[PDB]
Amino acid sequence: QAFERAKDLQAVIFDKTGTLTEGRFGVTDIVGFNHSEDELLQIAASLEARSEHPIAAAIVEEAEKRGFGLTEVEEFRAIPGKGVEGIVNGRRYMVVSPGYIRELGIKTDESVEKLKQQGKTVVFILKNGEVSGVIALADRIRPESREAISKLKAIGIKCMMLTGDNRFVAKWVAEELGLDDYFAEVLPHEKAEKVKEVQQKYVTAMVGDGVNDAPALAQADVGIAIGAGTDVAVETADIVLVRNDPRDVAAIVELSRKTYS
């Protein structure tokens, strides 16, 4: 009777990471300071090609996405507490963290604070000891997610999100999606209580991973497990979506409102 009662949903809460987002870092911005973005990316990725760090891997992936070939680095060095460095074409290049920049006393252009305000992770590209560019990364929003939310709002459903992520990241996602509300910094044992808080007003769905978000899905009037696949089965949640397509939430509501059994 889960499908049947989806028609009376008033609120939908999405878990962020992996559900509305890809659940991995990718590049959102490349910003050159009197230096081209294509060269900046190609240089940063050449230097980053050895690293196992998740952010380094995302920089290399983006160079692969744009089809940029890497360059062999000379006098390569990895500095724990800073980043990486090597010579490329007779100039000493480095890719370093905001922590290193602050420790060296280097001034970061005022525009970079806007990236930080979106909760994006920033790395700095130095050329001969001066900031040549920054690359910003986020756990990026799924292409389907904007449409998932607009379809839901169009049918009067309040669209929310919860996440353990910090308030800058959560705000950024909410604004990109036009969410009605969001809750940030929510640890895994605190999610169920946020669903009960929304339940004070609304017949509420929770959308999330069937294993990780089990309690929240259980507290919900309708628990929707997403991205379950066709391999292993989720047995606790009210409805299971095989694929990870958040637009299927509105498809359930809209079909349920057109039908009864």
mmCIF file of C-alpha atoms in Angstrom:
data_model
loop_
_atom_site.group_PDB
_atom_site.id
_atom_site.type_symbol
_atom_site.label_atom_id
_atom_site.label_comp_id
_atom_site.label_asym_id
_atom_site.label_seq_id
_atom_site.Cartn_x
_atom_site.Cartn_y
_atom_site.Cartn_z
ATOM 1 C CA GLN A 1 0.000 0.000 0.000
ATOM 2 C CA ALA A 2 3.107 2.224 -0.264
ATOM 3 C CA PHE A 3 2.453 3.245 -3.869
ATOM 4 C CA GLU A 4 -1.227 3.839 -3.004
ATOM 5 C CA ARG A 5 -0.463 6.251 -0.151
ATOM 6 C CA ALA A 6 2.267 8.216 -2.066
ATOM 7 C CA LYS A 7 -0.529 10.419 -3.492
ATOM 8 C CA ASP A 8 -1.043 12.012 -0.059
ATOM 9 C CA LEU A 9 2.599 13.042 0.314
ATOM 10 C CA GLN A 10 3.098 16.725 1.242
ATOM 11 C CA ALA A 11 6.853 16.803 1.835
ATOM 12 C CA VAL A 12 9.826 14.967 0.412
ATOM 13 C CA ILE A 13 13.181 14.869 2.180
ATOM 14 C CA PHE A 14 16.221 13.784 0.149
ATOM 15 C CA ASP A 15 19.447 12.587 1.691
ATOM 16 C CA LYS A 16 22.135 14.627 -0.120
ATOM 17 C CA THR A 17 25.252 12.593 -0.756
ATOM 18 C CA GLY A 18 24.829 9.982 -3.488
ATOM 19 C CA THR A 19 21.165 10.820 -3.911
ATOM 20 C CA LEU A 20 20.900 14.438 -5.113
ATOM 21 C CA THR A 21 24.713 14.418 -5.684
ATOM 22 C CA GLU A 22 27.074 12.030 -7.463
ATOM 23 C CA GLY A 23 28.745 11.182 -4.117
ATOM 24 C CA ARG A 24 32.259 12.034 -5.370
ATOM 25 C CA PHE A 25 34.339 15.140 -6.039
ATOM 26 C CA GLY A 26 34.477 16.718 -9.457
ATOM 27 C CA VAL A 27 35.800 20.031 -10.812
ATOM 28 C CA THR A 28 33.245 22.892 -10.793
ATOM 29 C CA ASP A 29 35.511 25.860 -11.604
ATOM 30 C CA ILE A 30 38.857 26.650 -13.172
ATOM 31 C CA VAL A 31 39.980 30.216 -12.572
ATOM 32 C CA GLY A 32 43.071 31.615 -14.258
ATOM 33 C CA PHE A 33 44.763 34.801 -13.056
ATOM 34 C CA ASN A 34 46.399 35.975 -16.263
ATOM 35 C CA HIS A 35 46.834 32.325 -17.326
ATOM 36 C CA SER A 36 44.555 30.166 -19.533
ATOM 37 C CA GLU A 37 42.162 27.649 -17.878
ATOM 38 C CA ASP A 38 42.944 24.858 -20.334
ATOM 39 C CA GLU A 39 46.718 25.143 -19.595
ATOM 40 C CA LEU A 40 46.000 25.519 -15.898
ATOM 41 C CA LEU A 41 44.049 22.231 -15.856
ATOM 42 C CA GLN A 42 46.547 20.397 -18.001
ATOM 43 C CA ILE A 43 49.393 21.546 -15.718
ATOM 44 C CA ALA A 44 47.606 20.764 -12.453
ATOM 45 C CA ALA A 45 46.669 17.283 -13.695
ATOM 46 C CA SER A 46 50.216 16.504 -14.897
ATOM 47 C CA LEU A 47 51.480 17.341 -11.411
ATOM 48 C CA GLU A 48 48.554 15.475 -9.800
ATOM 49 C CA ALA A 49 48.886 12.307 -11.880
ATOM 50 C CA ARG A 50 50.871 10.419 -9.209
ATOM 51 C CA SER A 51 48.609 11.180 -6.232
ATOM 52 C CA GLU A 52 46.102 8.896 -4.483
ATOM 53 C CA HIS A 53 44.322 11.871 -2.796
ATOM 54 C CA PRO A 54 40.640 12.001 -3.817
ATOM 55 C CA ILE A 55 40.938 15.691 -4.922
ATOM 56 C CA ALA A 56 44.020 15.007 -7.041
ATOM 57 C CA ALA A 57 42.194 12.109 -8.732
ATOM 58 C CA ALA A 58 39.218 14.408 -9.560
ATOM 59 C CA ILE A 59 41.614 16.940 -11.190
ATOM 60 C CA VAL A 60 43.123 14.178 -13.352
ATOM 61 C CA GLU A 61 39.620 12.864 -14.252
ATOM 62 C CA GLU A 62 38.570 16.287 -15.514
ATOM 63 C CA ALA A 63 41.649 16.500 -17.730
ATOM 64 C CA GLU A 64 40.640 13.060 -19.122
ATOM 65 C CA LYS A 65 37.102 14.393 -19.674
ATOM 66 C CA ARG A 66 38.390 17.290 -21.740
ATOM 67 C CA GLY A 67 40.893 15.050 -23.569
ATOM 68 C CA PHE A 68 44.046 16.877 -22.388
ATOM 69 C CA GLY A 69 47.267 14.826 -22.554
ATOM 70 C CA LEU A 70 49.522 14.903 -19.519
ATOM 71 C CA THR A 71 53.108 16.173 -19.432
ATOM 72 C CA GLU A 72 56.013 14.381 -17.797
ATOM 73 C CA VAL A 73 57.012 16.379 -14.686
ATOM 74 C CA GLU A 74 60.689 17.062 -13.831
ATOM 75 C CA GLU A 75 62.113 17.316 -10.298
ATOM 76 C CA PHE A 76 58.722 16.153 -8.991
ATOM 77 C CA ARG A 77 58.150 16.393 -5.217
ATOM 78 C CA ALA A 78 55.202 15.606 -2.916
ATOM 79 C CA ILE A 79 55.126 17.718 0.241
ATOM 80 C CA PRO A 80 52.743 16.382 2.929
ATOM 81 C CA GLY A 81 51.162 19.478 4.578
ATOM 82 C CA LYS A 82 51.213 21.412 1.295
ATOM 83 C CA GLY A 83 50.661 19.554 -1.982
ATOM 84 C CA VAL A 84 52.825 18.727 -5.026
ATOM 85 C CA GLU A 85 55.466 20.446 -7.100
ATOM 86 C CA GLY A 86 57.485 19.899 -10.266
ATOM 87 C CA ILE A 87 59.022 21.713 -13.222
ATOM 88 C CA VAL A 88 56.930 21.924 -16.405
ATOM 89 C CA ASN A 89 58.477 23.800 -19.362
ATOM 90 C CA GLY A 90 61.216 25.684 -17.486
ATOM 91 C CA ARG A 91 58.882 27.009 -14.762
ATOM 92 C CA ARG A 92 58.446 25.666 -11.231
ATOM 93 C CA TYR A 93 54.755 24.779 -10.746
ATOM 94 C CA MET A 94 52.986 23.689 -7.553
ATOM 95 C CA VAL A 95 49.489 22.535 -6.644
ATOM 96 C CA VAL A 96 48.788 23.300 -3.034
ATOM 97 C CA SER A 97 46.024 23.545 -0.413
ATOM 98 C CA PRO A 98 44.545 26.774 1.092
ATOM 99 C CA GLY A 99 46.379 25.685 4.272
ATOM 100 C CA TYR A 100 49.793 25.898 2.539
ATOM 101 C CA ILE A 101 48.918 29.305 1.008
ATOM 102 C CA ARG A 102 48.078 30.735 4.430
ATOM 103 C CA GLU A 103 51.289 29.255 5.927
ATOM 104 C CA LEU A 104 53.433 30.894 3.205
ATOM 105 C CA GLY A 105 51.712 34.293 3.632
ATOM 106 C CA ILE A 106 50.503 34.425 0.040
ATOM 107 C CA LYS A 107 47.543 36.706 -0.738
ATOM 108 C CA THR A 108 44.586 34.921 -2.306
ATOM 109 C CA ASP A 109 42.526 36.991 -4.784
ATOM 110 C CA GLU A 110 39.270 38.299 -3.240
ATOM 111 C CA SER A 111 37.159 36.354 -5.800
ATOM 112 C CA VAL A 112 38.262 33.006 -4.310
ATOM 113 C CA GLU A 113 36.230 33.688 -1.156
ATOM 114 C CA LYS A 114 33.072 33.235 -3.240
ATOM 115 C CA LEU A 115 34.151 29.657 -3.994
ATOM 116 C CA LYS A 116 34.800 29.009 -0.289
ATOM 117 C CA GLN A 117 31.331 30.471 0.452
ATOM 118 C CA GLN A 118 29.868 27.712 -1.741
ATOM 119 C CA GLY A 119 31.637 25.152 0.413
ATOM 120 C CA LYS A 120 33.771 24.100 -2.566
ATOM 121 C CA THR A 121 37.228 22.643 -1.949
ATOM 122 C CA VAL A 122 39.846 24.864 -3.582
ATOM 123 C CA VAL A 123 43.409 24.143 -4.741
ATOM 124 C CA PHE A 124 45.907 26.768 -5.813
ATOM 125 C CA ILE A 125 48.255 26.557 -8.807
ATOM 126 C CA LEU A 126 51.507 28.436 -8.239
ATOM 127 C CA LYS A 127 53.866 29.445 -11.065
ATOM 128 C CA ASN A 128 57.285 30.557 -9.882
ATOM 129 C CA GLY A 129 55.934 31.203 -6.389
ATOM 130 C CA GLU A 130 52.884 33.287 -7.478
ATOM 131 C CA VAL A 131 49.239 32.219 -7.718
ATOM 132 C CA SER A 132 48.510 31.393 -11.339
ATOM 133 C CA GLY A 133 44.980 29.991 -10.844
ATOM 134 C CA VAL A 134 42.624 28.025 -8.611
ATOM 135 C CA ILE A 135 40.544 24.929 -9.268
ATOM 136 C CA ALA A 136 37.428 24.406 -7.257
ATOM 137 C CA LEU A 137 35.718 21.062 -6.614
ATOM 138 C CA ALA A 138 32.456 19.880 -5.126
ATOM 139 C CA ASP A 139 30.479 16.714 -4.611
ATOM 140 C CA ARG A 140 28.557 17.581 -7.756
ATOM 141 C CA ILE A 141 24.783 17.704 -8.224
ATOM 142 C CA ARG A 142 23.327 14.926 -10.460
ATOM 143 C CA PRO A 143 22.054 16.228 -13.858
ATOM 144 C CA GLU A 144 18.621 14.754 -13.058
ATOM 145 C CA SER A 145 18.326 16.527 -9.669
ATOM 146 C CA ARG A 146 17.147 20.014 -10.736
ATOM 147 C CA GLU A 147 14.304 18.393 -12.689
ATOM 148 C CA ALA A 148 13.537 16.009 -9.781
ATOM 149 C CA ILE A 149 12.858 19.034 -7.544
ATOM 150 C CA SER A 150 10.962 21.218 -10.067
ATOM 151 C CA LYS A 151 8.636 18.323 -10.937
ATOM 152 C CA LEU A 152 7.927 17.875 -7.206
ATOM 153 C CA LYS A 153 7.305 21.578 -6.488
ATOM 154 C CA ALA A 154 5.019 21.798 -9.518
ATOM 155 C CA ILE A 155 2.670 19.315 -7.771
ATOM 156 C CA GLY A 156 2.765 21.208 -4.459
ATOM 157 C CA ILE A 157 5.263 18.973 -2.635
ATOM 158 C CA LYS A 158 7.698 20.755 -0.284
ATOM 159 C CA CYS A 159 11.204 19.740 -1.237
ATOM 160 C CA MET A 160 13.860 19.363 1.437
ATOM 161 C CA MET A 161 17.284 17.904 2.011
ATOM 162 C CA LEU A 162 19.302 16.642 4.913
ATOM 163 C CA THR A 163 23.027 16.007 5.050
ATOM 164 C CA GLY A 164 25.957 15.514 7.421
ATOM 165 C CA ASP A 165 27.834 17.976 5.258
ATOM 166 C CA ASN A 166 28.543 21.501 6.471
ATOM 167 C CA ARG A 167 26.216 24.447 6.087
ATOM 168 C CA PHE A 168 28.131 26.020 3.160
ATOM 169 C CA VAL A 169 27.849 22.931 0.964
ATOM 170 C CA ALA A 170 24.205 22.384 1.987
ATOM 171 C CA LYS A 171 23.296 26.008 1.278
ATOM 172 C CA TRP A 172 24.965 25.786 -2.145
ATOM 173 C CA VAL A 173 23.042 22.657 -3.146
ATOM 174 C CA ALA A 174 19.729 24.041 -1.815
ATOM 175 C CA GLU A 175 20.152 27.247 -3.809
ATOM 176 C CA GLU A 176 21.139 25.406 -7.014
ATOM 177 C CA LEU A 177 18.048 23.211 -6.674
ATOM 178 C CA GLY A 178 15.539 25.750 -5.300
ATOM 179 C CA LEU A 179 14.789 23.544 -2.253
ATOM 180 C CA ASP A 180 12.150 24.744 0.181
ATOM 181 C CA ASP A 181 14.322 23.816 3.187
ATOM 182 C CA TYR A 182 17.457 21.970 4.209
ATOM 183 C CA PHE A 183 19.196 20.663 7.337
ATOM 184 C CA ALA A 184 22.995 20.593 7.484
ATOM 185 C CA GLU A 185 25.522 18.910 9.858
ATOM 186 C CA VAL A 186 23.096 16.074 10.653
ATOM 187 C CA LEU A 187 24.975 12.980 11.879
ATOM 188 C CA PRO A 188 23.637 9.526 10.832
ATOM 189 C CA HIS A 189 21.855 8.898 14.176
ATOM 190 C CA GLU A 190 20.137 12.355 13.921
ATOM 191 C CA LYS A 191 18.440 11.964 10.557
ATOM 192 C CA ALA A 192 15.349 10.141 11.859
ATOM 193 C CA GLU A 193 14.627 12.975 14.287
ATOM 194 C CA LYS A 194 14.704 15.558 11.481
ATOM 195 C CA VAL A 195 12.093 13.509 9.590
ATOM 196 C CA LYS A 196 9.928 13.545 12.695
ATOM 197 C CA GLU A 197 10.359 17.353 12.894
ATOM 198 C CA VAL A 198 9.104 17.736 9.309
ATOM 199 C CA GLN A 199 6.354 15.230 10.139
ATOM 200 C CA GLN A 200 4.951 17.764 12.704
ATOM 201 C CA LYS A 201 3.557 19.517 9.604
ATOM 202 C CA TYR A 202 3.663 17.152 6.649
ATOM 203 C CA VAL A 203 2.926 13.722 5.330
ATOM 204 C CA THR A 204 6.598 13.193 4.563
ATOM 205 C CA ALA A 205 8.758 10.938 2.365
ATOM 206 C CA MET A 206 12.418 10.189 2.984
ATOM 207 C CA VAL A 207 14.602 9.330 -0.023
ATOM 208 C CA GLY A 208 18.024 7.781 0.582
ATOM 209 C CA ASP A 209 20.187 4.681 0.609
ATOM 210 C CA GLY A 210 18.369 1.574 1.864
ATOM 211 C CA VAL A 211 21.251 0.446 4.112
ATOM 212 C CA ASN A 212 22.843 3.667 5.310
ATOM 213 C CA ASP A 213 19.629 5.661 5.895
ATOM 214 C CA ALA A 214 17.551 2.778 7.276
ATOM 215 C CA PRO A 215 16.277 4.656 10.415
ATOM 216 C CA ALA A 216 15.225 7.774 8.457
ATOM 217 C CA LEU A 217 13.412 5.690 5.841
ATOM 218 C CA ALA A 218 11.682 3.835 8.704
ATOM 219 C CA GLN A 219 10.555 7.064 10.466
ATOM 220 C CA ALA A 220 9.099 8.428 7.207
ATOM 221 C CA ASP A 221 5.459 8.007 6.178
ATOM 222 C CA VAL A 222 6.916 6.703 2.926
ATOM 223 C CA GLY A 223 10.525 5.497 2.945
ATOM 224 C CA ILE A 224 11.950 5.458 -0.576
ATOM 225 C CA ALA A 225 15.254 3.613 -1.111
ATOM 226 C CA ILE A 226 17.034 4.804 -4.227
ATOM 227 C CA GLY A 227 19.873 3.356 -6.309
ATOM 228 C CA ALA A 228 19.302 -0.192 -4.983
ATOM 229 C CA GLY A 229 20.411 -1.859 -8.235
ATOM 230 C CA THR A 230 19.313 -5.263 -9.531
ATOM 231 C CA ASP A 231 21.984 -7.250 -7.612
ATOM 232 C CA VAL A 232 21.242 -6.983 -3.878
ATOM 233 C CA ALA A 233 17.777 -6.366 -2.466
ATOM 234 C CA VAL A 234 16.549 -3.808 0.112
ATOM 235 C CA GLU A 235 13.907 -5.369 2.384
ATOM 236 C CA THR A 236 13.117 -2.666 5.003
ATOM 237 C CA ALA A 237 12.017 0.386 2.904
ATOM 238 C CA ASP A 238 8.447 1.050 1.634
ATOM 239 C CA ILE A 239 9.363 1.468 -2.037
ATOM 240 C CA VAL A 240 12.638 0.649 -3.715
ATOM 241 C CA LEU A 241 13.917 2.368 -6.864
ATOM 242 C CA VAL A 242 16.372 0.082 -8.678
ATOM 243 C CA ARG A 243 18.067 3.044 -10.465
ATOM 244 C CA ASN A 244 19.393 6.271 -8.969
ATOM 245 C CA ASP A 245 17.090 8.727 -10.667
ATOM 246 C CA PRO A 246 15.478 11.195 -8.236
ATOM 247 C CA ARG A 247 12.893 12.153 -10.861
ATOM 248 C CA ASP A 248 11.266 8.800 -10.157
ATOM 249 C CA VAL A 249 10.009 10.212 -6.878
ATOM 250 C CA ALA A 250 7.637 12.609 -8.688
ATOM 251 C CA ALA A 251 6.724 9.851 -11.128
ATOM 252 C CA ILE A 252 5.522 7.760 -8.172
ATOM 253 C CA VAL A 253 3.451 10.641 -6.717
ATOM 254 C CA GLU A 254 1.923 11.663 -10.078
ATOM 255 C CA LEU A 255 0.905 8.072 -11.038
ATOM 256 C CA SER A 256 -0.439 7.396 -7.556
ATOM 257 C CA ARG A 257 -2.596 10.549 -7.775
ATOM 258 C CA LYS A 258 -4.053 9.203 -11.120
ATOM 259 C CA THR A 259 -4.822 5.744 -9.800
ATOM 260 C CA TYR A 260 -6.111 3.532 -6.993
ATOM 261 C CA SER A 261 -6.239 -0.294 -6.469
#
